[PDB]
Design a protein around this ligand. Structure first.
Ligand SMILES: Cc1cn([C@H]2C[C@H](n3cc(CNc4ccc(S(N)(=O)=O)cc4)nn3)[C@@H](CO)O2)c(=O)[nH]c1=O
Ligand SMILES: [Zn+2]
Length: 258
């Protein structure tokens, strides 16, 4: 697989290797705020990250992943639209070359500067690889980033990026607290969708928070210094690693808030 975000290997090409790219529950989507309906059946959302154990940060040539120890129920997502317990395995971001683009989800066609994805798998399927084969295998908590005041809880991530500049580089990343990346409100939209990168599996319950976090221009400029390429290859800045909005088809976006 040589998929990426360029003219020759970007989102408009992914369907050739991954025909599910044109499927019935692809992500991301535009969230039409006027059409999304409050759902009183939604239970309270439970983000329980007190025991989260971060291990490492990896540049995988598409984004960087902050990886967690998911060998036990430590950092879990429950409630809201979810049945059962979903374990945090990694988080990553998508971002732009410019502050006016970068998010995958859009809100009334507005693009944010970036989007954070906290990826969790359903513990009833035993491991992540089994979970991605199930329609309810994953829950991704999506958080928008706008440029304004710095996010203090993000700075430890920003400061390690110079040690993982190129594809395949990793660094120790223990004792990182993902609670520092959350906005005040847990108001959210939810809909059934997919991974937003190949293999684009239709296994995700999306939970997208309404309240963005603010990060500084300096923080996002450091994301844009990363490289898609490996060490000793021509430099290709890691920017615009977002898939655009996909057709909603036969789906309803539900709101947690009246
Ligand atoms: C802790 C750990 C991780 N790994 C593997 C599997 C991990 N993985 C695979 C994928 C599938 N791809 C994906 C995910 C989200 C989105 S999005 N943009 O949110 O819709 C798109 C694509 N997601 N995470 C991966 C990262 O940690 O490393 C283990 O094998 N053992 C381990 O112990
Ligand atoms: Zn993502």
């Amino acid at each position: 697989h040589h998929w990426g975000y360029g003219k020759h290997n970007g989102p408009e090409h992914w369907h050739k290797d991954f025909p599910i790219a044109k499927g019935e529950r692809q992500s991301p989507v535009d969230i039409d705020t006027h059409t999304a309906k409050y759902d009183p059946s939604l239970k309270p959302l439970s983000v329980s990250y007190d025991q989260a154990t971060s291990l490492r940060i990896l540049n995988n040539g598409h984004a960087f992943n902050v990886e967690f120890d998911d060998s036990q129920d430590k950092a879990v997502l429950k409630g809201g639209p979810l049945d059962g317990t979903y374990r945090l395995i990694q988080f990553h971001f998508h971002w732009g070359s410019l502050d006016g683009q970068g998010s995958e989800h859009t809100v009334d066609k507005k693009k944010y500067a970036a989007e954070l994805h906290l990826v969790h798998w359903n513990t009833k399927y035993g491991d992540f690889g089994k979970a991605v084969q199930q329609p309810d295998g994953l829950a991704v908590l999506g958080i928008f980033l706008k440029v304004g005041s710095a996010k203090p809880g993000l700075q430890k991530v920003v400061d390690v990026l110079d040690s993982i500049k190129t594809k395949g580089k990793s660094a120790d990343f223990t004792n990182f607290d993902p609670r520092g990346l959350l906005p005040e409100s847990l108001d959210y939209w939810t809909y059934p969708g997919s991974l937003t990168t190949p293999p684009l599996l239709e296994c995700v319950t999306w939970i997208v928070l309404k309240e963005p976090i603010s990060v500084s221009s300096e923080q996002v400029l450091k994301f844009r210094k990363l490289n898609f390429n490996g060490e000793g290859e021509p430099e290709e800045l890691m920017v615009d690693n977002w898939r655009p909005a996909q057709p909603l088809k036969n789906r309803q976006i539900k709101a947690s808030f009246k």
